Amino acid sequence: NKQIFVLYFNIFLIFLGIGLVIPVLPVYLKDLTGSDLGLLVAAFALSQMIISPFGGTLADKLGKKLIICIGLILFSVSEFMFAVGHNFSVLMLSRVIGGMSAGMVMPGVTGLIADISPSAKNFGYMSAIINSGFILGPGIGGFMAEVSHRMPFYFAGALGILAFIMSIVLIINWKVFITPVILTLVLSFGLSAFETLYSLYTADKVNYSPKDISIAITGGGIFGALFQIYFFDKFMKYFSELTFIAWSLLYSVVVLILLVFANDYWSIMLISFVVFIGFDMIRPAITNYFSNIAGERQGFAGGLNSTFTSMGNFIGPLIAGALFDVHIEAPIYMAIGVSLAGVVIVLIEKQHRAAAADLEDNW
Known part of the structure; x- marks a missing residue:
């Protein structure tokens, strides 16, 4: 039906708002270093992570149709304020209330899709759309940055108002979670930080x-x-979860290393096209891992996924900006190190499971 489509568009817009400021930020650097850029990008994620449980509680108190609308209003107000404001405190507050809007919208939309669809695969589509919006944000924002340096934010506010109108006219041991959660962080550390650096790096x-x-x-x-x-x-038929995640992380390591070893314009252009395959196949794999470990507390697993995705989306840009200030290529080295740490974590988990299975068969 159209309900899943409008909700998917809502989450797409919300997660596009995170990266829509990536290409405008170099223009705002001359109004700066990478540290305040990273802090600005990370404020959205920090606020969203903080208010996600509060947003869920508020939606329980009243929501599942009204919390989405109020989150859309907050998002539109934040983007308009970003469009007009120039003061750094004003920008900080705009990003904070944008994070508030994200934290008010995401629980409502995920609960509705979990309740307005007889599915598993729909959460995989959610993860795909979230990753696609996160990656595409900077692209579309930079495309609109040509006509005007504040046009992308006006477009996002108009899209938020349109989402308002569309929504109005529509609608247990914790040791098992310790492995994917870190993995989640790794992905949301490997991607966001890289996407914070890439633009500046390419600049x-x-x-x-x-x-x-x-x-x-x-x-x-x-x-x-x-x-x-x-x-x-x-690829799910060929490999399992952990092996596929390890291979995707190795592919990301190889591509990032090539990016460090790239100097020609068209070489780095070609590397940019294939750099995101590993991450775009990692994220649904992490979602499927989370769904496979938990058999009864699915909402708890989804909440953990969301909160740690936001936590990594917050902790990534800050370190990336500081390292970019220290060295031109440092954030990519940090991304490679985090990917290798994820590879080691996956190998350790695989060896643990193999040892347990071997002992059980020996039993």
Whole structure:
């Protein structure tokens, strides 16, 4: 039906708001360093993580149709305030209330889709759309940054008002979770930080342009989304969860290393297209892992997934900006290190499960 479509668009817009400021931020650097840029990007995620449980409680008190609307209003107000405001405190408050809107919208939409669809695969589509919106945000924002430096935020506010109108006219041991949760962090640390650096990095190594960065990021996101939607079932048939996650992390490591070893314009352009395949196939794999471990407390597992995704989306940009200030290529080294840590975690978990199964068979 159209209900899943409008809700999917709502989550797409909410998670596009995170990255819509990535290409405008270099323009705001001359109004700065990478540290305040990272803090600005991370405020949204921190507020969303803080208010996600409060947002769920409020939705329980009244919601599942009204909390979504009020979150959309907060999102539109935040984006309009970002469009008009110039003061750093005003920008900080706009991002904070945008995080409030994200934390008020996400629980409502995920609960509705869990209750307005007889499915499993729908949560995989949720993860795919969340990743696609997160990646595409900077691309579309940079594409609109050509016509005006405040046009993307006006467009986002108009989209939020349109989402208002559409929503009005529609609608146990914890040791098992310790492995995927870290994995979740790793992904949301590997992606966000990288996407915070890439633009700036491309603006420094080869003197990129906002339109050029936008087209590179959009092509990478579209290629990753298409590769996922056209090969996820086959790759799930071939490998298991943990092995596929390890191989995707190794692929991301190799591609990021190539990015460090890339100097020509078209070489880095080609690397940008395929850099996101690993992450776009990691995220649904993490979602399926979370669904597979938990058999009864599915809402708890989903809440843990969301809160740790937001926590990593907050802790990534700050470290990425500080490292970018310290060194030009440091954030990519941090991303490679985090990916290798995720590989080691996956290998340790696989060895643990193999030892347990071998002992049981020996039993």
